[PDB]
Symmetry: none
Subunit: 74 residues, 2 copies
């Protein structure tokens, strides 16, 4: 489970991503469906956040993999 | 900037999140705009992934440290 706080942050991050990538119709539709009231001011806090989080986690996952592999042969 | 490979994976994860969490109108529109085709295979592979990753930073930092400690005590 995601708490409502995590979910509202995740959805704002998705919304920012959709706009930023030029999927303006998906952004419109999703803001309504997720009942997101976010303006361009609030958005500043979310700019690039989804990509950032994704990239941070993949890098950690790659580190976990390398560590596990050295432990797997060991 | 993300590679096309990584952007495609991210986009499939977003698509799966939208479908599985009930944002159906957004799912439909997003696959059209992002020029993405989903199937049952992809649906299963990307199921829960975006939500999983979103919540994973501390758990993965912890796992990195736990693993490094297993390695540290293992050559000790």
């Amino acid at each position: 489970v995601l708490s409502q706080r995590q979910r509202d942050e995740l959805n704002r991050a998705i919304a920012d991503y959709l706009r930023s990538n030029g999927y303006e119709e998906a952004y419109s539709v999703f803001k309504k469906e997720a009942e997101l009231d976010m303006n361009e001011e609030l958005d500043k806090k979310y700019a690039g956040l989804l990509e950032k989080k994704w990239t941070s986690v993949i890098r950690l996952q790659k580190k976990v993999m390398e560590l596990e592999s050295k432990l797997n042969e060991a």
